[PDB]
Write a protein that binds this ligand. Structure first.
Ligand SMILES: O=C(O)[C@]1(Cc2cccc(Nc3nccs3)n2)CC[C@@H](Oc2cccc(Cl)c2F)CC1
Length: 259
């Protein structure tokens, strides 16, 4: 159905992994959107071509205000095109770099939006969202948009991004939606501190620190934040909180801007 000629392509928004993304406009409807270009050769070489295919298929049936909407996709012999919701304010990652760390209010609000999205995802049996700051885009009102279409990987090939992977994903082959509770904890930490909790010199050391749940807090992290993060970063996934509990955490309640 869709083809490149169905769109009026504008300026490049930026260069990402596997290709550029363009501000664009569907011809007939004049609807403004983002067009992500992905080169098949780079997808194959990076080992993520099958993940991307699965993700675009799953997410084509999903709709949530804090998930970057995927309107559709198409391909030729060379490239894959994603027709995406346009998120004007770019990645949370750039803001995190600019500011070094976020305050508790912006953080709790981000954690809220992420928790709502992940709750929706789980109801749809969609799990293990790679919600690292690079994959978090910003709507025109500063609302967070999960934009993970399966293009990061890390014997067995693991899906996602090392610093955010839970112990069960690195130690074993079985895991459920509780992995998304672990990620939420890493992100909350990262938001407040400026770096993820298990950051180490090498992959292997990161691999081991995650297994041991070996991390420390800086002194400035408040008690409520530490409490949430500590609950989220539990080794046994069965011991991790449910998303409802997160959304009703006193530190979240006391600090988030929205339900
Ligand atoms: O410089 C930046 O901030 C960007 C480009 C950029 C800058 C400003 C706004 C913007 N808005 C957008 N709305 C939808 C897609 S991009 N996009 C670099 C490329 C990056 O590429 C991606 C990253 C993760 C997931 C996805 Cl779908 C990506 F397309 C997006 C941020």
């Amino acid at each position: 159905q869709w083809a490149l000629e169905d769109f009026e392509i504008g300026r490049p928004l930026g260069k990402g992994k596997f290709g550029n993304v363009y501000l664009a406009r569907e011809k007939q409807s004049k609807f403004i959107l983002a067009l992500k270009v992905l080169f098949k050769a780079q997808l194959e070489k990076a080992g993520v071509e099958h993940q991307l295919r699965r993700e675009v298929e799953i997410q084509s049936h999903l709709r949530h205000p804090n998930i970057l909407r995927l309107y559709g996709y198409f391909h030729d012999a060379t490239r894959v095109y994603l027709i995406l919701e346009y998120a004007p304010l770019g990645t949370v990652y750039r803001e995190l770099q600019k500011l070094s760390k976020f305050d508790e209010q912006r953080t709790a609000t981000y954690i809220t939006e992420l928790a709502n999205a992940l709750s929706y995802c789980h109801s749809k049996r969609v799990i293990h969202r790679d919600i690292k700051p690079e994959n978090l885009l910003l709507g025109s009102a500063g609302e967070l948009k999960i934009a993970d279409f399966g293009w990061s990987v890390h014997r067995t090939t693991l899906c996602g991004t090392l610093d955010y992977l839970p112990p069960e994903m690195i130690e074993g082959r079985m895991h459920d939606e509780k992995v998304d509770l672990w990620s939420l904890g890493v992100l909350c930490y990262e938001f407040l501190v400026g770096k993820p909790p298990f950051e180490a010199n090498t992959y292997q050391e990161t691999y081991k620190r995650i297994s041991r749940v070996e991390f420390t807090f800086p002194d400035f992290v408040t008690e409520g934040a530490r409490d949430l993060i500590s609950r989220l970063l539990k080794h046994n996934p069965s011991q991790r909180p449910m998303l409802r509990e997160v959304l009703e955490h006193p530190w979240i309640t006391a600090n988030s801007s929205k339900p």
